[PDB]
Every structure is written in structure tokens, then in C-alpha cells.
Amino acid sequence: MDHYLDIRLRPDPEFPPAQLMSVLFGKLHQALVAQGGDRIGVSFPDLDESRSRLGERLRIHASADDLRALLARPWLEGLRDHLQFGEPAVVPHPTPYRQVSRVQAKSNPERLRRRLMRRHDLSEEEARKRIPDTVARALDLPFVTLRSQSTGQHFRLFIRHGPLQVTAEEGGFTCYGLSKGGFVPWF
Amino acid sequence: ILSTASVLAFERKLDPSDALMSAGAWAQRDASQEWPAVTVREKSVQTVDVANLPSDADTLKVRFTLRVLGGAGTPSACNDAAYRDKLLQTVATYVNDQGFAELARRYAHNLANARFLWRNRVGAEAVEVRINHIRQGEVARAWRFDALAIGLRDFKADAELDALAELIASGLSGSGHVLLEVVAFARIGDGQEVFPSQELKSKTLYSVRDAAAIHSQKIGNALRTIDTWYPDEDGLGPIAVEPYGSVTSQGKAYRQPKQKLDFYTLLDNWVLRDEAPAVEQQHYVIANLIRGGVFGEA
Numbered sequence: 247m248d249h250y251l252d253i254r255l256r257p258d259p260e261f262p263p264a265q266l267m268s269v270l271f272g273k274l275h276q277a278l279v280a281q282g283g284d285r286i287g288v289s290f291p292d293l294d295e296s297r298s299r300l301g302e303r304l305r306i307h308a309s310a311d312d313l314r315a316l317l318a319r320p321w322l323e324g325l326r327d328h329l330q331f332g333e334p335a336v337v338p339h340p341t342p343y344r345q346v347s348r349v350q351a352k353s354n355p356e357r358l359r360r361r362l363m364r365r366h367d368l369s370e371e372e373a374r375k376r377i378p379d380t381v382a383r384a385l386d387l388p389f390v391t392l393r394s395q396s397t398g399q400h401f402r403l404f405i406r407h408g409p410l411q412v413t414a415e416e417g418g419f420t421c422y423g424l425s426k427g428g429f430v431p432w433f
Numbered sequence: 434i435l436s437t438a439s440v441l442a443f444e445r446k447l448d449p450s451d452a453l454m455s456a457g458a459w460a461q462r463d464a465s466q467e468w469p470a471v472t473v474r475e476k477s478v479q480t481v482d483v484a485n486l487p488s489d490a491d492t493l494k495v496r497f498t499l500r501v502l503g504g505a506g507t508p509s510a511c512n513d514a515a516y517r518d519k520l521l522q523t524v525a526t527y528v529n530d531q532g533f534a535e536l537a538r539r540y541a542h543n544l545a546n547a548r549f550l551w552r553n554r555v556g557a558e559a560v561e562v563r564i565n566h567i568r569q570g571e572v573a574r575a576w577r578f579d580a581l582a583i584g585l586r587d588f589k590a591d592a593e594l595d596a597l598a599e600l601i602a603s604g605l606s607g608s609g610h611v612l613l614e615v616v617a618f619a620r621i622g623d624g625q626e627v628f629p630s631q632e633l634k635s636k637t638l639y640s641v642r643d644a645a646a647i648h649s650q651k652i653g654n655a656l657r658t659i660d661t662w663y664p665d666e667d668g669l670g671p672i673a674v675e676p677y678g679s680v681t682s683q684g685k686a687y688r689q690p691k692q693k694l695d696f697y698t699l700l701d702n703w704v705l706r707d708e709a710p711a712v713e714q715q716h717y718v719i720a721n722l723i724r725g726g727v728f729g730e731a
Binding site for chain 2: 257258266320327395
């Protein structure tokens with residue numbers, strides 16, 4: 247994956263950039279479940295780790311045929327007025343390589359309590375005795391908010407840009423474009 | 434000396450209605466008179482209000498009517514009669530030089546693209562807006578657009594859009610009663626989330642009678658996104674017409690009074706000291722007079 251395509255959120259008087267970034271990420275995810283495979287990687291070039299902000303840019307990492315297919319496919323319908331685009335081009339080098347991975351946290355003690363009750367046949371009080379409320383961990387990481395279509399929930403999807411490395415390795419990506427082993431050029 | 438008057442009250446022209454949202458199925462949009470409504474239900478997460486399409490419905494029918502009044506310059510309350518005559522002659526000079534032709538084209542564009550669908554548009558794959566001019570109760574002239582072809586940023590001329598602009602121009606000039614019916618269909622998804630207006634259990638959704646809806650002022654704010662004549666930076670599109678034209682969601686105040694491009698100094702220059710601005714800034718102050726409000730000091 248030596249090719250990239252930058253997408254920057256146009257400023258909108260109607261919307262904040264986080265809402266636009268989340269609906270763009272959901273539509274990219276739906277485009278990848280429509281496409282299939284594990285070869286599509288994402289990034290956030292104007293990231294702010296300190297303020298936990300994604301920035302205002304998103305960058306896809308793939309081959310050029312994937313970029314020209316995704317630049318005209320109807321997952322960009324209704325956002326071309328919200329979005330300005332670049333051109334499908336080759337990445338610069340030398341670049342450090344890092345991973346973009348979805349991090350999940352045990353954020354609700356009661357759901358894991360109900361799982362322990364389902365898998366150990368305990369009552370509610372044994373689940374509260376075995377699992378306290380200190381267990382709940384909150385991440386200090388930026389996030390998109392996503393509407394599931396299988397189930398009906400709205401959940402925060404916390405992303406982590408991994409450590410910078412001098413070389414990249416093989417692997418795939420999930421249907422959200424996040425690394426389950428793959429690496430992306432970071433520039 | 435012709436000082437400005439103490440109170441001015443401009444009635445709201447371009448009066449919209451509450452946008453009732455119902456749902457249904459695509460490819461039968463001409464059968465959309467008995468479609469079931471999108472109700473607001475409670476779902477426990479705390480207690481929030483959320484509203485979705487039914488599990489056999491993939492499009493949203495937002496319906497409202499828009500009444501265009503006309504007589505844009507005439508205030509309904511004013512003290513200084515001399516200021517009233519000067520403002521009347523100023524708006525008369527404006528409409529005599531050029532009628533409501535650019536402003537009606539921009540209002541027709543904001544009706545054409547479904548910008549009154551606020552959040553229900555951005556994930557849509559296809560939007561179709563039907564506008565029926567209703568005189569005497571049945572129909573006078575029917576329209577049908579693709580709201581995704583007409584983007585939100587650009588203003589592009591057309592055959593039917595200029596006809597709609599001529600109708601709204603005839604309305605705003607005081608030369609004919611115009612009542613429109615604006616219906617919009619948007620392919621959102623089967624059972625997806627719609628976004629009605631949000632009422633002040635932290636979250637409550639607006640509904641007139643067991644059926645979700647958008648506020649009338651939200652549709653009125655979406656129709657006023659015609660201002661392209663502010664000092665433009667960052668690649669921002671048209672904003673809603675406002676004195677000190679500001680974006681709360683952006684937190685930025687374009688047309689600040691440090692520059693001479695706000696509504697109030699422009700109006701005082703155009704009426705009192707006879708300093709006519711450019712055609713776009715007088716377009717902007719006539720759009721502010723169409724929007725209405727209370728203007729004047731204590």
C-alpha cells in the first residue's frame with residue numbers, strides 16, 4: 247500500500263467537525279463491508295494526542311484501484327458538499343510506520359457482571375462481590391461515535407495511533423480500516 | 434438631521450410551518466398521503482428520547498408548508514416617521530433598481546437542496562424534494578427536484594429553478610399570493626435514526642401530536658443560508674443571514690462591527706447618510722429585512 251488519498255472536512259455552519267468525521271467513518275466502514283477484504287487502512291494526519299482530537303483530516307491507505315473505486319462509489323453520496331478531496335497519489339518517503347487500532351475498555355461493570363452470571367450461574371450479589379465498581383476504566387483517547395446497524399446501539403469507538411516504527415509489517419485490517427496487524431505510513 | 438428611530442419591528446416574511454416527519458418506502462412516493470408517522474419513544478440507556486424509522490421503512494417524509502408574504506421593507510412599529518419614509522424610499526429604490534431576483538433565486542436554491550433536512554441529509558443516498566404551489570386549494574404548478582445534484586455550496590442556474598424564483602419573486606414583491614407545500618423524501622436506511630428537533634430525562638424530542646417534528650425556526654434558519662457576501666476565509670460556504678452574521682457551532686463571528694460589514698452600520702449608512710453599499714451588501718441587508726426582527730437602540 248504505497249498509495250494514499252487525503253480527505254479534509256470542509257467547514258460547515260451546520261455541523262461540528264466531529265459529527266462529520268463520525269458519519270464519514272461510518273460510511274467508509276459500510277463501503278468496506280460492501281467491498282470486502284482487509285487491505286484498506288486509515289489514518290488521521292492532523293491528530294492531537296494531547297487534547298484527544300482527531301483533527302480535521304482523514305487519509306486512506308490502499309492501492310490506487312481501491313482509491314479510484316472509492317472516489318466514485320455511492321458511499322460518498324451526500325458528502326461531496328461536506329468534503330473536499332485530493333488526488334490518488336503515491337505516498338512520500340522516508341516515513342515512520344505506526345498502527346491504528348481499536349481499543350476497547352471494560353467501561354460498564356454491570357455488563358461484565360451479567361456475563362459472569364451467564365457463564366458462572368451466580369446471582370447479582372455474587373457478581374457485585376466478585377466484580378466491584380473500581381474495575382470500570384475510562385480511556386484518555388480520541389474517539390468517533392457510531393450507530394450500529396446489526397444491533398441498535400450508539401457507541402464510542404476509541405482509536406489508538408500506535409508507536410512510530412522505522413519499518414512496516416504485513417497484516418490485514420478490519421472493516422473499519424483499523425489495524426489488526428497492518429501498518430500505515432505516517433506523514 | 435434624520436436620526437434613526439428608537440424601535441423598529443419587522444414581521445417575519447417567508448413564514449414556514451412545523452416540519453412533520455413521517456416514514457414509508459421508496460418507489461411509491463406518489464402514494465405518500467397516508468404514510469404512518471415517526472413517533473418519539475423513550476429508550477433507557479438514564480432516560481433519553483430517540484426516534485427511528487420502522488423496520489420495514491427506508492425513507493423519511495418531512496412535510497411543511499411555506500407562506501411568502503411580501504412587503505419586505507414596511508415596518509410594523511416605528512417612532513420617527515421621517516425614518517419610516519426614508520426606509521420606505523430606500524427599499525423602493527432597491528426593488529425598482531432590481532427586484533427580488535437574486536434573493537429569490539437563493540431562497541429557491543435553499544428550498545431545492547434539502548437543507549431543511551438538517552442531519553437527515555448527510556447520510557442519504559438519494560433526496561427528492563417536491564414543491565407544489567397551492568392556489569385555491571388543489572394545485573397551481575408542481576415541481577420535483579434532485580436535491581443531491583444541487584449542492585449546498587454553489588448557486589447554479591436552471592430552467593425550473595428560475596421559474597420557482599419567479600414565483601417567490603412575485604410573492605415578495607407583493608404581486609401575488611403564494612402558498613407552497615414542501616415535501617422531501619430521503620433514503621436513510623431501513624430502521625435508521627432520524628433527527629427531529631430537540632426539546633429542552635436530559636433529552637426530549639419535539640412532537641406536535643405523537644409524531645416527531647422539526648421546529649419552524651430551524652426550517653427558517655435553513656432557508657436563510659444565502660449569505661455568501663461576508664469576508665470569506667477557510668473555504669466556508671453560505672451562512673444564515675444574521676446581523677453580525679455569526680456561527681454558534683463554529684463559535685466565530687463574521688461581519689464584525691470593527692469592519693464596516695455588519696447589518697447595523699450598513700443600514701445606517703444606506704438610509705441616513707445616503708451611502709449605498711455594493712449590490713451584494715444591499716442584498717444582505719434586504720435579506721435581513723426579510724428575516725425580520727427588532728432593530729433599534731434604547
